[PDB]
mmCIF file of C-alpha atoms in Angstrom:
data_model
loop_
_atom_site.group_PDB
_atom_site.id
_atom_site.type_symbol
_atom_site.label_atom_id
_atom_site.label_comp_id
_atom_site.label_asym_id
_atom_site.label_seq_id
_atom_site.Cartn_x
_atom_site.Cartn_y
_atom_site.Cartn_z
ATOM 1 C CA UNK A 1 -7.718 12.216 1.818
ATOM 2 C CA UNK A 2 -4.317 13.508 2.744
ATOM 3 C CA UNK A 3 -4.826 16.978 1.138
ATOM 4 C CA UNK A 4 -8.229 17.395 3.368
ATOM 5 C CA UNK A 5 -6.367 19.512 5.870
ATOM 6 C CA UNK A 6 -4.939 21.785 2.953
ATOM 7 C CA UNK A 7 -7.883 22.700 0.858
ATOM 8 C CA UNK A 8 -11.141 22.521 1.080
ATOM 9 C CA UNK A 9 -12.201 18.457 -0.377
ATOM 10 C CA UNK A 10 -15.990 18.164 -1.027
ATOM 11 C CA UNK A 11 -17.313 15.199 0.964
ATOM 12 C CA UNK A 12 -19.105 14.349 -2.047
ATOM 13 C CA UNK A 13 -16.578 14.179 -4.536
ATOM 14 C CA UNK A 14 -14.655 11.699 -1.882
ATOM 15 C CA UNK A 15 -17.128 9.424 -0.343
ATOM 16 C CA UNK A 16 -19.019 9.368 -3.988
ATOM 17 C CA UNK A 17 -15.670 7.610 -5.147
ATOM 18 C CA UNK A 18 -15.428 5.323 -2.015
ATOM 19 C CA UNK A 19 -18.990 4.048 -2.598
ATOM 20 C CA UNK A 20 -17.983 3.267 -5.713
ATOM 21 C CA UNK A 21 -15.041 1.337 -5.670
ATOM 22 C CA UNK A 22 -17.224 -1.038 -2.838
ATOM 23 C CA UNK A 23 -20.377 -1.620 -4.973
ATOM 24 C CA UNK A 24 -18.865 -1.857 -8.215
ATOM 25 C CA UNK A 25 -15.420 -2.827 -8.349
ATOM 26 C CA UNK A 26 -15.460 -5.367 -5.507
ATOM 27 C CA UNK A 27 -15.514 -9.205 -6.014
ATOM 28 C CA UNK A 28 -17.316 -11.250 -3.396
ATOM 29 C CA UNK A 29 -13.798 -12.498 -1.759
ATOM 30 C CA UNK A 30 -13.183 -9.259 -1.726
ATOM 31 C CA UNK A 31 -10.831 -8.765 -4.149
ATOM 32 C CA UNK A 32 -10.436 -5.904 -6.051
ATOM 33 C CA UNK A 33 -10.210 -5.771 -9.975
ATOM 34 C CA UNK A 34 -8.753 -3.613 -12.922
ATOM 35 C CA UNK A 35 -11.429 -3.308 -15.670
ATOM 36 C CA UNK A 36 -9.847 -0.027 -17.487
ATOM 37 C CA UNK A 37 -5.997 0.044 -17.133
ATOM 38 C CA UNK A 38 -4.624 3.885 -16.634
ATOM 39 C CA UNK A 39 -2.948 5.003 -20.327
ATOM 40 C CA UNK A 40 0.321 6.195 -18.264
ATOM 41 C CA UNK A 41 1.380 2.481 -16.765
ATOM 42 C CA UNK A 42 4.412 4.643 -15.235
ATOM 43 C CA UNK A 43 2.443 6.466 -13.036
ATOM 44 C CA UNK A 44 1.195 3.142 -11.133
ATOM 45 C CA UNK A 45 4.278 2.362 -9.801
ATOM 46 C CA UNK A 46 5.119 -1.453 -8.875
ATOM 47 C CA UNK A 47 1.588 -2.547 -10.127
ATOM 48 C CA UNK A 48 2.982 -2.694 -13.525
ATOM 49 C CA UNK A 49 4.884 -6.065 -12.353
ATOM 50 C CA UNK A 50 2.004 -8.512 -14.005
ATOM 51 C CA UNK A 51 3.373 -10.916 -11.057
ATOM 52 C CA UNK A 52 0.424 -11.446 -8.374
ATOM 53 C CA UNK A 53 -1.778 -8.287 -9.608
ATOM 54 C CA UNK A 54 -4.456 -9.418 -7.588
ATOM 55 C CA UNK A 55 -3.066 -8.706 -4.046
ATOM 56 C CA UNK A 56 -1.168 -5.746 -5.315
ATOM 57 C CA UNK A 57 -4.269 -3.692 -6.940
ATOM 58 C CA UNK A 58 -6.191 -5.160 -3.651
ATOM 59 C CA UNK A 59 -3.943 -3.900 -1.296
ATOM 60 C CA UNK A 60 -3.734 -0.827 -2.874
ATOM 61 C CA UNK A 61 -7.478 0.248 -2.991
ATOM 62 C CA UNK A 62 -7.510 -1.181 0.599
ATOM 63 C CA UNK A 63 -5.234 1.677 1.906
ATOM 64 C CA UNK A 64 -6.992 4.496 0.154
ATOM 65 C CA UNK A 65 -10.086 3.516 1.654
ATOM 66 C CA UNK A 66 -8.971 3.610 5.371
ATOM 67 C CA UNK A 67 -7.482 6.698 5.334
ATOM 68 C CA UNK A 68 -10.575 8.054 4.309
ATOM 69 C CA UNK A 69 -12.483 6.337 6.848
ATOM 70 C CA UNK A 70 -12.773 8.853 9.442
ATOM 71 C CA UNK A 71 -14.158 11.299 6.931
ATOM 72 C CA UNK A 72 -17.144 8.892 5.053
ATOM 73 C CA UNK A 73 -18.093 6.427 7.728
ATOM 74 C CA UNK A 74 -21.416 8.627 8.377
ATOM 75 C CA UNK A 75 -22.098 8.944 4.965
ATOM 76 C CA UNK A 76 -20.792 5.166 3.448
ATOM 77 C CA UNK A 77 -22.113 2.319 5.305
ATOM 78 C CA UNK A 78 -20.583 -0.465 3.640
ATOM 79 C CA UNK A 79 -17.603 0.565 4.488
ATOM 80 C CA UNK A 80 -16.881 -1.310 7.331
ATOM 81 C CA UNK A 81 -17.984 -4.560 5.825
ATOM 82 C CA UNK A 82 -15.454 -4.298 2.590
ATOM 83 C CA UNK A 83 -12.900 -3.317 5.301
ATOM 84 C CA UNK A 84 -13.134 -6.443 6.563
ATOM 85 C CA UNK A 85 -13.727 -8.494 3.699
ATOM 86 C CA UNK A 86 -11.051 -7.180 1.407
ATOM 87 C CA UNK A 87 -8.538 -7.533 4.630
ATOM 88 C CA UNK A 88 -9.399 -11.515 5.085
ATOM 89 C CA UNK A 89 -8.357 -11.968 1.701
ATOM 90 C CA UNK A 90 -5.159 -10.474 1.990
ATOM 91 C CA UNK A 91 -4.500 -12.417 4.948
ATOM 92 C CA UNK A 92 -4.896 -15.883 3.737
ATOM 93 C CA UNK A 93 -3.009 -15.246 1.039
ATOM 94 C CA UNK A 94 -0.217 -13.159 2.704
ATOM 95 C CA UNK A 95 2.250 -16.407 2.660
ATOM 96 C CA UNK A 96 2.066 -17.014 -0.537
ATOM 97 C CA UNK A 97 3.942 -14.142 -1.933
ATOM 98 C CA UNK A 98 7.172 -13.481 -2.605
ATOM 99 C CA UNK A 99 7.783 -9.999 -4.016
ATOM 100 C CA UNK A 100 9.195 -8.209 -1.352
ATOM 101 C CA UNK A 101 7.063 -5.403 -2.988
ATOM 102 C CA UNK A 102 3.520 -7.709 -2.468
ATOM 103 C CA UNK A 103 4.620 -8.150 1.124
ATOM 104 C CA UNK A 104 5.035 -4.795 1.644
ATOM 105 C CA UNK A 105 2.309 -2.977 0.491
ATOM 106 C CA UNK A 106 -0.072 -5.719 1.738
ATOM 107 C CA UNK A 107 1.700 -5.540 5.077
ATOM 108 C CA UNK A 108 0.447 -1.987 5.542
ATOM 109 C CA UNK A 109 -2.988 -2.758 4.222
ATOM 110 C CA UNK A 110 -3.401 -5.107 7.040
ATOM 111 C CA UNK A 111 -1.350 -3.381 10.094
ATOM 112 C CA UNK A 112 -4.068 -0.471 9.568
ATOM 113 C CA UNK A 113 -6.437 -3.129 10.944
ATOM 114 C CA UNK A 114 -4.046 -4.743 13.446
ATOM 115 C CA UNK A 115 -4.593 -7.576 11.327
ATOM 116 C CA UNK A 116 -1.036 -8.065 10.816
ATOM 117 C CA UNK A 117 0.258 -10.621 13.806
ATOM 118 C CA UNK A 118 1.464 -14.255 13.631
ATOM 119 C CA UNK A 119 3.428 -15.756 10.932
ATOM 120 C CA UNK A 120 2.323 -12.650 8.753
ATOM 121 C CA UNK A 121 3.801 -10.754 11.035
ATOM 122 C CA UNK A 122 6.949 -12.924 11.129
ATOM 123 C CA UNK A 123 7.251 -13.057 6.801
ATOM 124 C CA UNK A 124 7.112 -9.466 6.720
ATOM 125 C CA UNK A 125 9.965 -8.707 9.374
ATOM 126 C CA UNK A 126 12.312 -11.022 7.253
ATOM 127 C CA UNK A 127 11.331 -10.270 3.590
ATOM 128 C CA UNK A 128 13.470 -7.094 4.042
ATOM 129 C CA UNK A 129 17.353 -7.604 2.924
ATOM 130 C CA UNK A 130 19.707 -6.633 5.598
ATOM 131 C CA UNK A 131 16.817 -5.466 7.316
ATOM 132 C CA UNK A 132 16.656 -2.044 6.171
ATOM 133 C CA UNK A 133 14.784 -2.129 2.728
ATOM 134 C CA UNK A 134 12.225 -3.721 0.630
ATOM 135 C CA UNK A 135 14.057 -4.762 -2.388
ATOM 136 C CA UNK A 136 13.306 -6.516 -5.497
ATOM 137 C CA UNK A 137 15.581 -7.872 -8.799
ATOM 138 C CA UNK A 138 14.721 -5.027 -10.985
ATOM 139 C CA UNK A 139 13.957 -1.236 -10.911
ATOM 140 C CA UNK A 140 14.813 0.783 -7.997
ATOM 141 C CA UNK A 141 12.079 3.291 -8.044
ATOM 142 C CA UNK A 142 9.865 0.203 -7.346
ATOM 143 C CA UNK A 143 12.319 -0.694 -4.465
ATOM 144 C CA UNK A 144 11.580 3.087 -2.610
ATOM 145 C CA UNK A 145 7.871 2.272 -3.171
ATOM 146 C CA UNK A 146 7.831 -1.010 -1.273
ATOM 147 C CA UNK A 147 10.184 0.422 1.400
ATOM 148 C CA UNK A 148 8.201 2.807 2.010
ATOM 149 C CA UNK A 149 4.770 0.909 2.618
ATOM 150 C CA UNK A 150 7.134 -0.955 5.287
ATOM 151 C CA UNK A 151 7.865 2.080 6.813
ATOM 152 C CA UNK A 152 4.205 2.999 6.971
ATOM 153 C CA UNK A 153 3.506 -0.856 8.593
ATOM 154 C CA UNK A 154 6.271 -0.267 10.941
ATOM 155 C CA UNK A 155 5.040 2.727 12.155
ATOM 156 C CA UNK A 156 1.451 1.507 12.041
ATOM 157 C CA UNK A 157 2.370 -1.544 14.244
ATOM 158 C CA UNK A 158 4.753 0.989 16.321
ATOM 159 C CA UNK A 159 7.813 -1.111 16.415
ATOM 160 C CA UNK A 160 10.558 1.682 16.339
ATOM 161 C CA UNK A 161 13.165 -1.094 17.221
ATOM 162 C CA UNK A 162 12.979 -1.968 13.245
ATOM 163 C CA UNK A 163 12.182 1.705 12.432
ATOM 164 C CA UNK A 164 15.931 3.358 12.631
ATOM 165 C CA UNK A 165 18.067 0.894 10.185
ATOM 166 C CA UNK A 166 15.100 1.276 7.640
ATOM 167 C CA UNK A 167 14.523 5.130 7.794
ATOM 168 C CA UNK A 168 18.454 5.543 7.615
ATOM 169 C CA UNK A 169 18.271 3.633 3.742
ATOM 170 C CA UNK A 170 16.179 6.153 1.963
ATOM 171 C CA UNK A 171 17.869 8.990 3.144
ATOM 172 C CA UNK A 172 20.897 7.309 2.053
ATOM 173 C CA UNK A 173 19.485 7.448 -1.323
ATOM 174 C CA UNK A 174 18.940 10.804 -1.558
ATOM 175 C CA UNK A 175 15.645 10.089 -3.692
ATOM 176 C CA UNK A 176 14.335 13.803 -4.043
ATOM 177 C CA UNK A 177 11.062 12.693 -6.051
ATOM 178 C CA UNK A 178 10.514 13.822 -9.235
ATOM 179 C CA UNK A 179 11.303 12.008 -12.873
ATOM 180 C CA UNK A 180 9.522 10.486 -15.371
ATOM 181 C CA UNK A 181 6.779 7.963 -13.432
ATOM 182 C CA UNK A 182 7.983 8.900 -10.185
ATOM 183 C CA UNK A 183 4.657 9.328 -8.824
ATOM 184 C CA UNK A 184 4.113 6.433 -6.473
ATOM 185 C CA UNK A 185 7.944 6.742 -5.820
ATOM 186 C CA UNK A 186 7.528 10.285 -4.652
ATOM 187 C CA UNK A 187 3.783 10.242 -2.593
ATOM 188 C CA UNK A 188 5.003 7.662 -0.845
ATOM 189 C CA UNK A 189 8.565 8.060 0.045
ATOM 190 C CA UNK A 190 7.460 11.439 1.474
ATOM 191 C CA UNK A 191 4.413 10.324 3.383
ATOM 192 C CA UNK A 192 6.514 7.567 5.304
#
């Protein structure tokens, strides 16, 4: 979906993945769940964390399906109604995390919507340590991931009051991608 402007993606290839994830891979709640785990668990980035799996994989597929809204709406009509559905799940359960990782990459999945106001909004805002990153006790290629889904919400909500001191950390880092499973940790810090 973000390499649609670069090459030439077959409509069919795309949407015939959407329409699957929806029909097959889609509990009634909404919730969205792992039947065949990848071989390369480094490539998944924080979802290896067994903590809360089912908002993280959820939020996740969530994302990848509205940025390719635009391009199979015409062709995928339940779409719109797994939008919704997968979104009220993440919302009811958005206080009960506490991964700063969870709450970020759920916070995105739901500021696509606008569904990301309230206390939600509130918990979000002051998960982030000295309110400029997305950390969590443990690796800090996970810790770029999840800052960089906040990013993404920030911008999505446009709040470019909060925008500055975060955007200022990862270049700090001088992260420049690459390294064995660095592939969330690269897509991501690069797209925000």
């Amino acid at each position: 979906s973000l390499a649609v402007n670069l090459i030439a993606i077959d409509s069919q290839v795309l949407c015939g993945a959407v329409k699957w994830l929806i029909l097959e891979k889609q509990k009634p709640d909404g919730v969205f769940q792992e039947d065949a785990p990848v071989i390369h668990q480094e490539m998944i980035g924080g979802l290896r964390n067994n903590n809360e799996k089912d908002m993280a994989l959820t939020a996740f597929v969530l994302i990848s399906l509205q940025e390719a809204k635009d391009i199979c709406e015409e062709q995928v009509n339940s779409l719109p109604g797994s939008i919704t559905k997968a979104g009220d799940f993440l919302e009811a359960n958005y206080m009960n995390l506490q991964r700063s990782y969870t709450v970020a990459i759920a916070g995105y999945a739901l500021a696509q919507m606008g569904r990301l106001k309230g206390p939600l909004l509130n918990k979000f805002l002051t998960t982030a340590k000295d309110k400029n990153r997305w950390e969590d006790p443990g690796k800090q290629l996970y810790n770029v991931e999840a800052t960089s889904y906040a990013l993404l919400a920030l911008l999505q909500l446009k709040d470019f009051d909060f925008v500055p001191p975060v955007v200022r950390w990862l270049n700090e880092q001088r992260y420049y991608g690459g390294g064995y499973g660095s592939t969330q940790a690269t897509f991501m810090v690069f797209q925000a």
